[PDB]
Amino acid sequence: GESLELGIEFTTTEEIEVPEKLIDQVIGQEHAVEVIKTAANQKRHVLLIGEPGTGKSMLGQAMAELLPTETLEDILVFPNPEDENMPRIKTVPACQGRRIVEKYREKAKSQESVLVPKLLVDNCGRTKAPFIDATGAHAGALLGDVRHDPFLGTPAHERVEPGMIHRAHKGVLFIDEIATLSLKMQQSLLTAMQEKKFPITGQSEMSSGAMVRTEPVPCDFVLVAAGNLDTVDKMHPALRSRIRGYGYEVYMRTTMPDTIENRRKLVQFVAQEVKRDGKIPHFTKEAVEEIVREAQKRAGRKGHLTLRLRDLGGIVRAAGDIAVKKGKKYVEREDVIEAVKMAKPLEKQLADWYIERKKEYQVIKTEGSEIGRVNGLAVIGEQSGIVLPIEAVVAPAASKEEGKIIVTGKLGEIAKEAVQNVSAIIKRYKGEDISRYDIHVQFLQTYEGVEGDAASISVATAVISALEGIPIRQDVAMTGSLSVRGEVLPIGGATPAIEAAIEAGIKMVIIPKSNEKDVFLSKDKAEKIQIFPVETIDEVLEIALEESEKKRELLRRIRETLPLSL
Amino acid sequence: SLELGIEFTTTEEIEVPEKLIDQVIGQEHAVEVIKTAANQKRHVLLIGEPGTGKSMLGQAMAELLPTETLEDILVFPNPEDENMPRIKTVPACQGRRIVEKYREKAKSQTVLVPKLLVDNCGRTKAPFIDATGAHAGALLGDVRHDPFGTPAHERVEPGMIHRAHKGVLFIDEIATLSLKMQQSLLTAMQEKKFPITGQSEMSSGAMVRTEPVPCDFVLVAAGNLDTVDKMHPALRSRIRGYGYEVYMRTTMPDTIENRRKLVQFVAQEVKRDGKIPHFTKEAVEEIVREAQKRAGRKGHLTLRLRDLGGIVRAAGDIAVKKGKKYVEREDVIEAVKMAKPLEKQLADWYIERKKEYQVIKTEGSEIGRVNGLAVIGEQSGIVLPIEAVVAPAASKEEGKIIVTGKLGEIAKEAVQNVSAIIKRYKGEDISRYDIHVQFLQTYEGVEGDAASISVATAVISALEGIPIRQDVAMTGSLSVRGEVLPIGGATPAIEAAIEAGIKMVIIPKSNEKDVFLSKDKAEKIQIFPVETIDEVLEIALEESEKKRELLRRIRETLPLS
Amino acid sequence: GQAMAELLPTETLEDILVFPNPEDENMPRIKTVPACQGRRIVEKYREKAKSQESVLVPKLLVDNCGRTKAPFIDATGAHAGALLGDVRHDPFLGTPAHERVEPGMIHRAHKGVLFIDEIATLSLKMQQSLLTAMQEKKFPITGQSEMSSGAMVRTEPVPCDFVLVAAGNLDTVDKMHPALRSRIRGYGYEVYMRTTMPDTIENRRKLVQFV
Ligand SMILES: Nc1ncnc2c1ncn2[C@@H]1O[C@H](COP(=O)(O)OP(=O)(O)O)[C@@H](O)[C@H]1O
Ligand SMILES: Nc1ncnc2c1ncn2[C@@H]1O[C@H](COP(=O)(O)OP(=O)(O)O)[C@@H](O)[C@H]1O
């Protein structure tokens, strides 16, 4: 059998307890959770900065549940006998608003054998402070508006519409992408935050609503603004300064340690997601384990689990949908594996489509050995791996005064400097004669370019192979950065890279020892390939170069130029 | 002919399926997502080019929805507050009756009959409402203006979101809807109910707002690669976070089953166009040959069915003009020429103008002159004469390879890869010369690495004084170890050679399956697929001991494998 | 585009009339009749109205009486209201919504040709609306400015069965609404104009005809 320790024994998630309140359902953002609790108690504004689907809105909703619920109010607007264009405002305990209006409305009907106040905000029946999401709202929606009057017309007070700031009175006002609001909206929000009251007035100068401006309307909200890294510098400086000086700024984390306790929380995660969705079956232990395996793969950091839970939640819902279509009673591993494929976001679908097309015209060799030809590995996007064949040949120098290392493949800056670090090793073991050769290296078919330094050890191997005439095993693939002292440095996407080797039929893959905990392979795939974690360039060469006296002499010669420390 | 996995004489014999989901051609991922989503009422976002079947998948999803549970929506007068008409939903067909009940009382008389907003009585399929481009009042509902007076409830009009209650609401180009309408759409999605009110503030309908009206629709939104970045953020997060996202494929595997779908496709296109005759079998085969050439991908068929449908129609129009009873292969061939993409007419125009002032030898042999082949755009080739001459180095310290022709970045690196091979076989003497290579008359530039073997041949010929056959044309990329790499547009390249009267063409072996020629053209040219640079040279260079020595020298610097 | 117009049928041309809607003033009703009939119908109602003031008069939106060939309507550079139709504002006891209805060039092109050069310079919204008109062959007239009372008026769909002849130079291709180009491409033809012809005796003879 193949399983993981989840810190709890269960058959299906139906046995897993789901915390009652939202704040306890938030996983892995301990700091953000502590800020929200303090902000809810001390009534302070918050700015949440992070990637989408990281729980910013969830936190805003959680804060709402932590606010007092026994003094909620209704907001009424009445006609002003003394100044029709300044409708009067009144707040009363929740549920009272409906009664007051109902009462006046009945009298008005009766009398026509009287003016009726309008209920702007009705909080009757609320068991918790309001959560108002004003993300992307327009000026009138956010701050309130007053309809135009074509005519003998309509009383100004009943043309008054509340803004989300008013609906958020004694609750939470959530605004993601806060920096995309106009400067004027951000200034007005700031004013509302300072006064806790904000008059409603018509937004369009061309409307008769423009001359109507009610008494200040209560808007005692706790603001929970959100956005990504660009938001910081684009938002109204005065608004950011206000939150910063009277509240908290939080940067959302994207990973959490892969500990037994944290996995146990992911068990809770699947359960709360199934419960919140209400349209999917419960998950068996194997299915939850697959969810955890996905969390490890999506972390992008060894020893950690992802906190991109909107995405992982998408996989939970898709797995359930698939189970339902198959008429199953519980979601199983097979359903999760199928959900991962079916629920890929647009970005990964494009990356995979691209790599699929490239592989159809790939020139990969996986049997025998070749001089100056090595199978490197590349990762496109987040998870799209592909074998990266690289070739090298040695020629007499075109210039009588110097030897050059000429590399092609549209390399970006990091890749180009990676080749320079490699050349230091080459020049050192080869010696003075190096100035007598031009070494041409070619990353085959990289028409969209080469980025990063993960092909460092590959270039080194191809070049050393070409210089010495020692063939390179084609059944070997490799990836790894390199230091000028010969140390193999870590790379990103070890799993996607290894999966590409496996798909291509490569039997052995070399990776930095630093990345051994970044390898996530099912029992099945693990049996198809031998993984060699390495720390130094000489170890890469002893695995990749074909055996001979020539090779052993080469290794000895190279080891002579590397530090003993290595 | 070709195997189409179905026998028939004309498309008139081909049966177009019952289920719309079955009609959809080659978007297997999308089809499975639609089936999985319909079953669970999950929203779906389809991203792809126009005419790729987005609307089709939306209609198909409506069909996969329950029908026995549809409901009618009625709006009633509200005695307490006229301006807030009341809403009642009941099982389908029950709406029509409830209306007459009250209507009878009208006779027995003050009695205000409720209005039937949405009537699904008699529907066999869940509703499919295409709200693409709708204005606010049409999408969200409206209340007619009253100069005086008519009862408010009677002036209420359902929005498409309401007509789509328990059905599918389809919106292509969703990101072009005002951010405000997108907001209302979001709310309608969140609550599954949305109050109807007057949209224009110039109207008295604006003082009316009904009770939230049910709008439990499944949203199938559509757009292109720019849509997600442009739509209302709250709407975007909702869809990206809780629905399925699908990128519409642009090609499909070339199998018997898929070709069969292309037959069905032709059949459907003739039927819905209604202005053209049916297609014989060979005509359909020609449509498939086109699907193959348009894939620009060996072993695949194109999925820009809007384009294929364009050829079908142009072929039909040609059949009609000639007074033919059926569309035949000949008609389709003329259709391809008559309805080509403006991009191809442009490339063809350009190639035609250039041929007028072109230097082209197609017989004999020449030292330092090779007939390379270039592909302009996606499906138009032209012979690319490349010349090389060897001169004394201008610098006594280094020899150089100077290439002209306005080469882009990839073409320049291709030249560097070629110089590796030249330097290796030529030895140290190479630093004693300046090799000038010229892509003749390439005033709009040279792009890509498809001229790699051509440059290698021209340079080797010039260095060795070995004439190159002019009745040979060639295209292919190259690795520093001498391996010939694949190129794009192998067919258009070969076609240029045929049009130029060149008898032999060299192409990489890996592109062998990218060659799509009719029997007529195939018999006019000899195709030589190659794997390594020495094979290119043995075909293109004139026989001589000089050439035999060159090949021996070359093969000595290439891998043995 | 003009040549194509001369090749279209000319015996079934119609007149387009807009009438007042007793049941919903903001949705004027539309009626098409054989060419020349429109003028008569209006003339008739107009005379009765005059008489009665000791009645509402329908408005003739498109009058094709006397045309010997299908209309050629050049909408190059036209604004939204000119292309798709508009409804004038009402300052006041006012003017019936139906007589404030103005036809768009798409309507005038009903059963004729709608020519639009520099098609890519039209706003995206105009191109989307044109696409809709092409698909339905009918397009309601509504006020273009939200600030106008014409904005709340939206007539029944008005016929606009035109054959579109869009034009432009090489930049047009990539700048126009992709859905519009795709529509023409899949249900019509794209043509690249040549700039030269062979210098043959036959072609010179045509230049004689040209002068
Ligand atoms: N840290 C987390 N713990 C639990 N669930 C989370 C977390 N982050 C995201 N989610 C889940 O993701 C869904 C989407 O998150 P959301 O709050 O909308 O993200 P954001 O506002 O940052 O885009 C949540 O409603 C919940 O199901
Ligand atoms: N995948 C497909 N399978 C079958 N027909 C297709 C496909 N894509 C496009 N078409 C054909 O093209 C016409 C236009 O497609 P449509 O669904 O309107 O595309 P989109 O909504 O993406 O514009 C269809 O009604 C049908 O005739």
Structure-token match 């059905």, residue found: B167
CB contact under 8 A, A177 and B233: yes
CB contact under 8 A, A398 and B420: no
What CATH number is associated with residue A321? 1.10.8.60
Residue A166's alpha-carbon distances to A134, A173, C168, in angstroms, are 11, 9, 52
Q: Is B241 in the pocket of ligand 1 (CB under 6 A)?
A: yes
Structure-token match 């996606």, residue found: B378
CB contact under 8 A, B176 and C124: yes
Structure tokens at A14: 């139906």
- The distance of B351 to chain C (nearest Cα, Å) reads 13
List chain B residues with CB under 8 Å of A324: 39-40
Tell me which H or E stretch contains A441. strand A437-443
Answer whether B229 touches A (CB < 8 Å). Answer: no
**Distance in angstroms (rounded) separating the CA atoms of residues B418 and B449:** 10
Nearest CA to ligand 1 atom 26: A310
- Shared domain check, A209 and A285: no
Amino acid at B188: A
Which residue stretches of B408-488 are H helix?
409-426, 452-464
**How far away, in angstroms, is B54 Cα from ligand 2 center?**
7
- Please name every residue paired with A491 in a beta bridge, in sequence order, or none if there are none: none
Residue A523's alpha-carbon distances to A1, A2, B111, in angstroms, are 9, 7, 75
**How far away, in angstroms, is B312 Cα from ligand 2 center?**
14
The size of the B-C interface in CB pairs under 8 A is: 69
Name, in order, each residue with C-beta under 8 angstroms of C172's C-beta and a sequence gap of 6 or more: C118, C119, C120
Amino acid at A210: A
Q: Is B50 in the pocket of ligand 2 (CB under 6 A)?
A: yes
Residue in chain C nearest B274 by alpha carbon:
C187
- Shared domain check, A104 and A47: yes
Range of the domain at B422: 359-561
Structure tokens at B97: 């009756």
CB contact under 8 A, B50 and C179: yes
List chain B residues with CB under 8 Å of A392: 480
| Angle, CA C163 vertex, CA C161 and CA C167 arms, to 5° | 140
Amino acid at B246: V
Q: Is B237 in the pocket of ligand 1 (CB under 6 A)?
A: yes
Task: With beta carbons less than 8 A apart as the criterion, state whether A132 and A172 touch.
Answer: yes
What CATH number is associated with residue A390? 3.30.230.10
- Shared domain check, A459 and A384: yes
Answer whether B488 touches C (CB < 8 Å). Answer: no
Task: With beta carbons less than 8 A apart as the criterion, state whether A209 and A144 touch.
Answer: no
Other residues' Cβ atoms within 10 Å of the Cβ of residue B69: 11
B514 DSSP assignment: G
**Distance in angstroms (rounded) separating the CA atoms of residues C175 and A234:** 30
Structure-token match 């003394």, residue found: A82
Structure tokens at A368: 């025998």
Which residue stretches of A451-510 are H helix?
456-468, 494-504
User: Using CB atoms and an 8 Å cut-off, which of residues 27-46 of chain C contact chain B?
Assistant: 27
Q: Which backbone phi and psi does C70 adopt, to 5 degrees?
A: -55, 140
Which residue stretches of A346-412 are H helix?
346-359
Name, in order, each residue with C-beta under 8 angstroms of A103's C-beta and a sequence gap of 6 or more: none
Amino acid at B523: E
**Distance in angstroms (rounded) separating the CA atoms of residues B228 and B174:** 9
Q: Exposure pattern of B366-384 as b/e (b: 16+ CB <10 Å)?
A: bbbbbbbbbbbbebbbbbb
CB contact under 8 A, A138 and B298: no
Residue A499's alpha-carbon distances to A449, A458, A507, B191, in angstroms, are 21, 18, 11, 44
Residue in chain B nearest C152 by alpha carbon:
B200
Answer whether B559 touches A (CB < 8 Å). Answer: yes
CB contact under 8 A, B242 and A314: yes
Which among A319, A321, A312 is positioned nearest to A294, based on CA atoms? A312
User: In Å, how far from its chain's centre is CA A511?
Assistant: 26
Structure-token match 């009009």, residue found: B157
Structure-token match 């310290």, residue found: B397
List of chains touching C (3+ CB pairs within 8 A): B
Q: Is C192 one of the annotated binding-site residues? A: no
Please give the torsion angle defined by the CA atoms of residues C17, C22, C26 and C28, in that order, rounded to the nearest 10 degrees: -10
Residues preceding gaps in chain C (C to N > 2.5 Å): 54, 92
Residue C140's alpha-carbon distances to B6, C107, C143, C148, C159, in angstroms, are 46, 10, 10, 17, 8
Tell me which H or E stretch contains C30. strand C29-34
Backbone region of residue B245 per phi and psi (left: phi > 0; alpha: psi in -120 to 50; beta: other values): beta
CB contact under 8 A, B306 and C191: no
- The distance of B400 to chain A (nearest Cα, Å) reads 7
Task: With beta carbons less than 8 A apart as the criterion, state whether C101 and C155 touch.
Answer: yes
- Shared domain check, A45 and A82: yes
Structure tokens at A177: 């992408």
Closest-lying ligand to the alpha carbon of A26? 1
Other residues' Cβ atoms within 10 Å of the Cβ of residue A204: 17
Which residue stretches of B167-253 are H helix?
179-191, 227-230, 233-242
Task: With beta carbons less than 8 A apart as the criterion, state whether A146 and A29 touch.
Answer: no
**How far away, in angstroms, is B55 Cα from ligand 2 center?**
7
- Shared domain check, B517 and B434: yes
Task: With beta carbons less than 8 A apart as the criterion, state whether B78 and B84 touch.
Answer: yes
List chain B residues with CB under 8 Å of C124: 176
Task: With beta carbons less than 8 A apart as the criterion, state whether B280 and B8 touch.
Answer: no
**Distance in angstroms (rounded) separating the CA atoms of residues A513 and A511:** 6
Task: With beta carbons less than 8 A apart as the criterion, state whether A253 and A306 touch.
Answer: no
DSSP state letters, C78-138: --HHHHH-EE---------GGGGEE--HHHHTTTSEEEETTGGGS-HHHHHHHHHHHHHSE
- Shared domain check, A196 and A174: yes
List chain A residues with CB under 8 Å of B399: 398
Please give the torsion angle defined by the CA atoms of residues A407, A551, A429 and B430, in that order, rounded to the nearest 10 degrees: -50
Which among A256, A295, A287, A258 is positioned nearest to A271, based on CA atoms? A287
β-bridge pairing B213-214 and B193-194? antiparallel
HSE (CB half, 13 Å, CA atoms) of B140?
25
Task: With beta carbons less than 8 A apart as the criterion, state whether B550 and B541 touch.
Answer: yes
Structure tokens at A118: 């309008």
Other residues' Cβ atoms within 10 Å of the Cβ of residue B344: 19
Q: Reduced to 3 states, what is the DSSP secondary structure of residue B151?
A: coil
**Distance in angstroms (rounded) separating the CA atoms of residues B414 and B403:** 11
CA-based radius of gyration for chain C: 20
Q: Is B305 in the pocket of ligand 2 (CB under 6 A)?
A: yes
Which among B68, B183, B171 is positioned nearest to B128, based on CA atoms? B171
The size of the A-B interface in CB pairs under 8 A is: 165
DSSP state letters, B80-136: S-TTS-EEEEEETTHHHHHHHHHHHHHH----PPPEEEE--TT-SS--EEE-TT--H
The CA-based diameter of chain A, rounded to the nearest angstrom, is 114
- Shared domain check, A236 and A89: yes
CB contact under 8 A, B346 and C151: no
Other residues' Cβ atoms within 10 Å of the Cβ of residue B250: 18
**Distance in angstroms (rounded) separating the CA atoms of residues B96 and B98:** 6
Q: Which of A213, A233, A251 is the last residue of a domain?
A: A251
Closest-lying ligand to the alpha carbon of B242? 1
**Distance in angstroms (rounded) separating the CA atoms of residues B522 and B539:** 19
Q: Is B51 in the pocket of ligand 2 (CB under 6 A)?
A: yes
Q: Is B55 in the pocket of ligand 2 (CB under 6 A)?
A: yes
Q: Which of B337, B358, B379 is the last residue of a domain?
A: B358
Total domains in the fold of chain B: 3
- The distance of B280 to chain A (nearest Cα, Å) reads 33
Q: Is B27 in the pocket of ligand 2 (CB under 6 A)?
A: yes
- Shared domain check, B519 and B554: yes
**How far away, in angstroms, is B44 Cα from ligand 2 center?**
17
Ligand 2 closest atom vs CA B272: 27
Angle between helix B28-40 and helix A309-325 axes, rounded to 10 deg: 80
**Distance in angstroms (rounded) separating the CA atoms of residues B534 and B528:** 13
β-bridge pairing C86-87 and C101-102? antiparallel
Residue C67's alpha-carbon distances to C43, C58, C102, in angstroms, are 19, 22, 21
Task: With beta carbons less than 8 A apart as the criterion, state whether B318 and B283 touch.
Answer: no
- Shared domain check, B418 and B481: yes
Structure-token match 């547009």, residue found: B489
Structure tokens at A241: 């300064």
What CATH number is associated with residue B6? 3.40.50.300
- Shared domain check, B223 and B78: yes
List of chains touching A (3+ CB pairs within 8 A): B
Amino acid at C122: L
β-bridge pairing C158-159 and C138-139? antiparallel
Q: Which backbone phi and psi does C16 adopt, to 5 degrees?
A: -115, 125
Which among C119, C122, C103, C109 is positioned nearest to C184, based on CA atoms? C119
HSE (CB half, 13 Å, CA atoms) of B45?
26
Backbone region of residue B192 per phi and psi (left: phi > 0; alpha: psi in -120 to 50; beta: other values): left
Residue A137's alpha-carbon distances to A59, A176, A241, B159, in angstroms, are 20, 10, 22, 22
- Shared domain check, A153 and A68: yes
- Shared domain check, B312 and B228: no
**Distance in angstroms (rounded) separating the CA atoms of residues B381 and C166:** 29
Which among B230, B377, B448 is positioned nearest to C173, based on CA atoms? B377
Residue A282's alpha-carbon distances to A2, A328, A334, B243, in angstroms, are 20, 10, 14, 19
Which among B561, B405, B391 is positioned nearest to B479, based on CA atoms? B561
Kindly provide the resolution of this structure in angstroms, with one decimal: 2.0
Strands (E), A307-430: 369-370, 373-380, 384-396, 405-408
Which among B279, B281, B251 is positioned nearest to B5, based on CA atoms? B281
**Distance in angstroms (rounded) separating the CA atoms of residues B470 and A192:** 82
Residues preceding gaps in chain B (C to N > 2.5 Å): 109, 148
Q: Which of B336, B358, B380 is the last residue of a domain?
A: B358
| Angle, CA B55 vertex, CA B245 and CA B159 arms, to 5° | 95
**How far away, in angstroms, is B230 Cα from ligand 2 center?**
24
Which among A355, A458, A381 is positioned nearest to A415, based on CA atoms? A458
Q: What is the spatial order of strands in the sheet that C72-74 belongs to?
A: C72-74, C113-116, C163-166
Closest-lying ligand to the alpha carbon of B313? 2
**How far away, in angstroms, is A61 Cα from ligand 1 center?**
10
DSSP state letters, B334-381: HHHHHT--HHHHHHHHHHHHHHHT-----SSEETTEEEEEEE-SSS-E
Task: With beta carbons less than 8 A apart as the criterion, state whether A83 and A341 touch.
Answer: no
**Distance in angstroms (rounded) separating the CA atoms of residues A330 and A13:** 9
Name, in order, each residue with C-beta under 8 angstroms of A441's C-beta and a sequence gap of 6 or more: A390, A391, A392, A405, A406, A407, A408, A419, A459, A462, A463, B480
